[PDB]
Design a protein around this ligand. Structure first.
Ligand SMILES: *[C@@H]1O[C@H](CO)[C@@H](O[C@@H]2O[C@H](CO)[C@@H](O)[C@H](O)[C@H]2NC(C)=O)[C@H](O)[C@H]1NC(C)=O
Ligand SMILES: *[C@@H]1O[C@H](CO)[C@@H](O[C@@H]2O[C@H](CO)[C@@H](O)[C@H](O)[C@H]2NC(C)=O)[C@H](O)[C@H]1NC(C)=O
Ligand SMILES: *[C@@H]1O[C@H](CO)[C@@H](O[C@@H]2O[C@H](CO)[C@@H](O)[C@H](O)[C@H]2NC(C)=O)[C@H](O)[C@H]1NC(C)=O
Ligand SMILES: *[C@@H]1O[C@H](CO)[C@@H](O)[C@H](O)[C@H]1NC(C)=O
Ligand SMILES: *[C@@H]1O[C@H](CO)[C@@H](O)[C@H](O)[C@H]1NC(C)=O
Ligand SMILES: *[C@@H]1O[C@H](CO)[C@@H](O)[C@H](O)[C@H]1NC(C)=O
Lengths: 72, 495, 495, 72, 495, 72
């Protein structure tokens, strides 16, 4: 809806603090761990799929973080 | 003097040939200007006003639906149409239902259906726009006159207000004593309006990006408008319900106020209930200080007998402010202020309130100076009653260099190339480094745009990691200029 | 009756074992039951109702801050203390402002500050849980009597409405002329309550589940709370404004009526206005047809000159229906209805209005039957004055098993293991596939929860790509039951 | 805000149509496509960084889609 | 002369440079200053006082719970609610009890319960804080030439009692008969307040660390908090009894007063009664001996006939104190005091009470001096009646300079770098001796801060074992300053 | 409780004696040897576990002293 596209990387930032800062600066990192801690099966399955695709460990951890981040 | 205890101060030292220094003053900060034999001044922008706005586009926050009509046809007999579908204040949808003999129809198939409902707004959100013309800035000019009730005092007649408008941006300030001062401000190359929209909800207001404003999914209407009868994207705030392939319906989606307050994250709040008073952004100023006298040269020295009426009181950014009273004779006179040490006395410590004078003997005078990073002794009187005071200062040795580096790196992380306009005409170094910052700013821009707190840190570690593994000494590039700079910026994002 | 014209009608052919068959019926769909005797019946679940709900958690949707008071504290000595922090109506925040001599202190530093405002809720939202007991389903049975103007009408009193509870039993339903039906229904297993919450906005209501409803970012309050002033999670509906370093202020974050309708994209809407009327879900019945008379058995066969009064209309699923009228004597009689091929050799097709009957009158009757996939004569009389009616049926040869196959796969996509409950206890070939389907649905259900339309397609492409590039014959197990099934369940999701 | 965690994969779905399917079933991909059509620099940078990492032709495309999808 | 009998005496000679010498004096110690002329003085810090304090945080010691209420609720229908939970005097918690048909609800599950109790404080521990200004030190400057009954009495007025504030200056202090002594003291670098908290229990007080005081688990309260109801960390003094899965209860823990007296094992007791009197810490004085007369010049010598009235009485550090009484004619006169050997050819031994003098003949007078190790004779008067008194100072050796080395090493153990301030601008030994200490003190700081008596000895033994068995001659860098010094400081801590 | 955090290594210490020194300087050692006298079995078990790991004779006595002292 309108609550998405949240006006973050638009430039226009000064040292005056913004509208909802230190409240929306960590909300994605809190809903992503609420979502992990209430859906463990997709995190495990994304660890198997992330461990399968990827030779080196860095791209395995990258595919794990990105696959865990695309799902809400 | 209007500047003390604000925690974003940015001292400016020096002047360049013909006596002008190039500064950039912001709404949070207040810049202190120090020259060689010229009084030290204190500047702050305090008010940015957009004088007359023209509304660009009106969205609706909440609406209502009346006059619900529905029209269905047979399976093979085409598709329904009633005259509320051509009327552009009704919202409409074609769906398809089950028909048979129980519906009085025949042929037993799926027949089309339409539902229309009259759209009526009842809460608005007006996005106004202004041109860079008639955008008026207000800067107060407060000198370091040692004078009672002055230090953090943001009221009264301690300063002089000047008004930078982009058609006439010179407007010299004649203040009483100390001569005059002119400022060549460049307000067009600042915040860059024509691409920013003064959005306005009921009792609040924001300052949002213009292309951000023109692609919000919400029913809009042009600005120059009188009747609410041509809302364009009405389907973004209604919904059509067709369960079971029986009849369908339409309902309103609800008040979009708090969802828009989640959209307005990152936008800087302004206020436009009375005026259009912005309180964000910077202004580049060229400070020409030629006709700037000192107000108290060719006075004689004091005879002595000072007394302290308010104590030393160290400020953040490591300066001290004492307030002293004078009793004696010959009342227009110069305070014998020094910051010495003990025996075989050296001069260690700079004076900020330069040439402190006594005027109106029965009234205090508050002097500002800075010590070095250890023991230091303040001396005020001269032969009898020499007012020697101890003072100790913590840190301020190498940590002052890293605090200066973090002020320059934060000041370079907030401002763009304009952060290079904080010094007085470096010639080839400031111009070449600023030009490289415009190239790196234009390539770092049109990239990292729409990219948040987290994604810059992720995209910085996955370019630092491929920097450390690369060869041919590209490691000294992909770590330095794009690897840890984007990590640092990604920490400083969402100011 | 009541089911010709409704799409996704199911046909179940069986009385095997005793005289029972398991059926599973939803609100949108309908079920038609046939046997070698035991007349064809029609089943429609029309209503779920929860009787006495108990509220669980109330959420504040729109609020209002009143009586904003702030209190500041000069630096290096303590926190501010304000008397309204003791009451939990007031939302509170400790921030840290800049203080110096200019704002009434003695030291230059960064002192404390509090702000407080009384949080007053002014529109609510309440979710109510119910028990698996005291909820009453309403189901309509209607026989193929071929009554005049009874084809597909929801209105009209043609079928018996019976209401089943988990307090109930065998639940006899004596429907006249035909005997009785008993339906061993399992209402406790159908929609899995003690996991879902009956949410309630202003005039709408949804069917959301608990561990989505309990962890919502709105300020809430317990269900057993009169005088609803003590809101618990108040800091997610206000916000605090400390813009540069000056005073901080409170503002309400707005209205989440239209913001939470975005959160409900995936929830099925119910009707909590006058009683908790759920029009969604399924339930599993066991129909027992051991006491069904035929209503037309022991009537003498008819003797000629029928008359067609409504044209043969082809339904979806290819089952035509004709309304004929009888002229002649012996008015309680059967009808010589048969569909034969061209050349009139074999009797093809099947009747769905098993034992058609002229009910006592000069009133029309309705006959439903399915033709085969080519040309056919439809013959509705005895030889002096028959009615030979040509008919052609399109497709219906090899597309029928793929439509049946993918509607069985959609039936296994909507329902879980319960989709193995259309058969009459197949035993070693049905009752083991339910166990394998529920352990596969438990492994597949523990994964893939919380992901959407797009993500199941992406993971289906990934697992399919691992399967097509594997070894040791894990190709099959990695795509034929995991790779492709996830793609199909990703297409058929979001109903 | 409350407009996230949008009750998408929870079970509980029947043949009856949910609250905002066909309007909440394509708007995520539409939001991503208009995001790319407004911010085309992160697409090029994600293509170069997705090409540099990922030493097969599949996980280059996988890392490209996931990096394109985590930035809104 | 308020110096003989104190165990810590600290003789300092040399007024070199100009006529100044740095002395550092703490509360337990005295300081005796000597010169080539300029008579010998005795300095003792006697009192520190903090003038007006401001309280920082108020903890409670013992409390009281009344109005205990509770409210339980049936399973799966949410959390209970209670009107006392809205107030913040009431400590509350939630728990899970067993509930079934016996409790009167139903459903046989694990239910929710709340418990509330009003938390009233009745013993209060408040910790105050002061600024480094308005905090004065009281010093006593008592001169030698001891009159009637003044050897070590704190009682009586034999010297001046000048006060030193950081508001103050050169601090003139005129001595009656002597000249005028001035001290430029440093009361800001002395004890380093703003990390100090003047903690106050019922009748006692301590000087504790600030961050130690703020990290203290007890229910606290702001220093600016009138009507002390809104206690904050209340759950650290109450506890909740839920023994089985049945009802829970509240109980108070009890008086934490005796449990705080074990928290303070390592804090110095001050007395906060009729003022904030500190009796710990040191003070660095810049002693200036420009204007000092000897009080006894321009007199004649005696004519003989002394009489020893108090015996020889060796002070520890070997600085014997005799008391004689003169009888004669010219009453104001200089005493003929010498310390020579057996056959009086050499003068060996030093006089500390320099220029002893008889005033007001009918009053004994007492003389202090320093013999050498061994036999040394004391000659008082002239030839008709002089006193030749034996004294055997108990034979020492190198032992005196190993006691001086242990005394200065102990002074470096208590005082970190201020122990390098007994000299007079030493330069190439002293001014770098501070600096190389300050680099090593900030590294010894925060690497052994928080560890105790035992752990410094353990890490000392470890880090001298891993250096004792090392290579490339890191034996010296891991033994001579890191191992042995942490063992010595390990056995000198817990003063 | 506040019987812990005992204000020991906080700096701040001068020549005059603290609140209770020579009454709290040896209480920890007497406490951790009285605990040994009431509990020999953990001392034997920590001698065995200290002797298995710990190749050198300094790691053995170090792990024994640390494991013995870390159990109040
Ligand atoms: C569904 O059934 C009702 C009830 O039988 C039908 O309504 C009847 O229609 C006939 C002819 O129009 C009237 O003579 C009756 O009086 C009606 N009965 C009632 C109770 O109103 C209705 O027509 C049927 N709907 C169909 C076949 O679509
Ligand atoms: C800021 O300055 C104004 C004037 O420049 C001060 O106002 C004066 O306050 C004194 C009290 O000390 C009054 O006697 C004067 O009459 C006031 N003058 C006015 C109102 O014009 C004001 O107090 C200063 N504020 C601070 C915080 O220093
Ligand atoms: C410390 O000095 C005081 C002050 O002189 C001494 O007190 C005097 O003691 C003599 C002894 O007989 C009395 O005659 C005086 O009257 C006292 N003076 C007073 C009380 O003001 C005191 O004795 C000295 N201390 C010692 C240990 O001798
Ligand atoms: C909508 O309904 C109102 C109700 O009175 C009435 O004005 C009319 O029927 C409709 N108005 C329109 C279609 O403008
Ligand atoms: C809120 O303000 C009104 C008037 O402004 C006052 O009467 C009322 O008591 C206030 N509420 C509280 C809780 O103090
Ligand atoms: C606590 O109980 C006493 C009973 O005597 C009652 O008077 C008092 O009002 C109660 N306190 C509160 C806060 O209700």
């Amino acid at each position: 809806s309108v609550a998405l596209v949240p006006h973050v990387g638009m430039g226009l930032e000064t040292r005056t603090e913004t509208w909802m800062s230190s409240e929306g600066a960590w909300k994605h990192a809190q809903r992503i761990e609420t979502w992990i801690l209430r859906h463990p099966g997709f995190t495990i399955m994304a660890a198997i799929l992330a461990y399968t695709i990827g030779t080196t460990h860095f791209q395995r951890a990258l595919i794990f973080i990105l696959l865990t981040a695309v799902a809400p | 003097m209007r500047c003390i205890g604000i925690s974003n101060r940015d001292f400016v030292e020096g002047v360049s040939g013909g006596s002008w220094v190039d500064i950039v003053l912001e709404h949070g900060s207040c810049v202190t200007t120090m020259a060689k034999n010229k009084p030290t001044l204190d500047f702050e922008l305090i008010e940015t006003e957009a004088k007359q706005p023209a509304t660009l586009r009106k969205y609706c926050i909440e609406a209502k639906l009346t006059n619900t009509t529905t029209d269905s046809r047979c399976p093979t007999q085409g598709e329904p149409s009633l005259n509320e579908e051509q009327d552009k204040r009704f919202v409409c949808k074609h769906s398809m239902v089950d028909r048979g003999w129980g519906n009085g129809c025949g042929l037993f198939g799926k027949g089309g259906i339409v539902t229309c409902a009259m759209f009526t707004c009842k809460k608005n959100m007006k996005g106004k726009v202004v041109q860079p013309e008639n955008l008026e800035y207000t800067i107060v000019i407060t000198p370091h006159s040692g004078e009672e009730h002055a230090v953090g005092n943001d009221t009264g007649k301690h300063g002089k207000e000047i008004k930078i408008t982009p058609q006439s941006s010179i407007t010299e300030a004649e203040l009483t004593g100390y001569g005059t001062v002119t400022m060549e401000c460049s307000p067009r190359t600042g915040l860059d309006f024509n691409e920013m929209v003064l959005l306005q909800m009921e009792n609040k207001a924001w300052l949002v990006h213009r292309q951000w404003f023109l692609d919000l999914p919400l029913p809009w209407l042009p600005g120059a408008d009188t009747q609410g009868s041509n809302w364009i994207q009405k389907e973004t705030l209604v919904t059509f319900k067709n369960p079971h392939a029986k009849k369908q319906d339409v309902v309103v989606l609800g008040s979009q106020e708090g969802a828009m307050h989640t959209a307005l994250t990152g936008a800087t709040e302004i206020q436009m209930s009375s005026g259009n008073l912005l309180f964000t952004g910077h202004l580049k100023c060229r400070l020409r200080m030629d006709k700037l006298q000192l107000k108290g040269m060719s006075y004689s020295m004091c005879t002595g007998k000072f007394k302290v009426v308010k104590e030393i009181a160290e400020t953040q950014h490591g300066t001290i402010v004492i307030r002293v009273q004078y009793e004696g004779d010959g009342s227009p006179c110069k305070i014998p202020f020094e910051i010495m040490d003990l025996e075989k006395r050296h001069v260690l410590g700079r004076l900020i309130t330069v040439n402190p004078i006594v005027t109106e003997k029965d009234s205090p005078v508050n002097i500002e100076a800075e010590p070095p990073f250890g023991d230091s002794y303040i001396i005020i009187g001269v032969e009898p009653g020499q007012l020697k005071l101890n003072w100790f200062k913590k840190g301020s040795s190498i940590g002052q260099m890293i605090e200066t580096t973090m002020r320059g790196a934060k000041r370079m992380a907030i401002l763009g190339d304009t952060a290079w306009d904080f010094g007085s005409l470096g010639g080839v170094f400031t111009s070449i480094g600023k030009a490289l910052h415009q190239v790196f700013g234009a390539i770092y821009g049109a990239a990292f745009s729409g990219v948040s707190w987290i994604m810059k840190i992720l995209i910085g570690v996955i370019i630092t990691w491929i920097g450390m593994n690369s060869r041919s000494t590209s490691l000294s590039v992909s770590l330095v200029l794009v690897g840890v700079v984007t990590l640092y910026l990604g920490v400083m994002v969402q100011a």
